[PDB]
């Protein structure tokens, strides 16, 4: 989750922090 901070864990592949949740069409946890 990107609660306050970005994801910086899955965002690498395109896991866009949607509602403070790494999301790349489908979530990526964190």
Short mmCIF file of C-alpha atoms in Angstrom, two decimals:
data_model
loop_
_atom_site.label_atom_id
_atom_site.label_comp_id
_atom_site.label_asym_id
_atom_site.label_seq_id
_atom_site.Cartn_x
_atom_site.Cartn_y
_atom_site.Cartn_z
CA UNK A 1 0.00 0.00 0.00
CA UNK A 2 0.95 3.60 -0.78
CA UNK A 3 -0.84 4.93 2.37
CA UNK A 4 1.15 8.16 2.36
CA UNK A 5 4.21 7.14 0.40
CA UNK A 6 4.04 5.75 -3.19
CA UNK A 7 4.27 1.96 -3.68
CA UNK A 8 8.02 1.74 -4.51
CA UNK A 9 7.74 -2.01 -4.50
CA UNK A 10 5.58 -3.01 -7.52
CA UNK A 11 5.19 0.38 -9.25
CA UNK A 12 8.30 -0.69 -11.22
CA UNK A 13 6.19 -2.82 -13.58
CA UNK A 14 3.29 -0.30 -13.69
CA UNK A 15 1.50 -0.88 -10.36
CA UNK A 16 -0.03 2.60 -10.17
CA UNK A 17 -0.93 3.58 -6.60
CA UNK A 18 -4.74 3.47 -6.87
CA UNK A 19 -6.47 4.26 -3.53
CA UNK A 20 -3.05 3.81 -1.89
CA UNK A 21 -2.89 0.27 -3.29
CA UNK A 22 -0.34 -0.63 -6.02
CA UNK A 23 -2.47 -1.30 -9.15
CA UNK A 24 -1.50 -2.35 -12.71
CA UNK A 25 -4.99 -3.22 -13.96
CA UNK A 26 -4.96 -5.86 -11.20
CA UNK A 27 -3.27 -5.25 -7.79
CA UNK A 28 0.32 -6.08 -6.86
CA UNK A 29 -0.08 -5.97 -3.06
CA UNK A 30 1.69 -3.31 -0.89
#
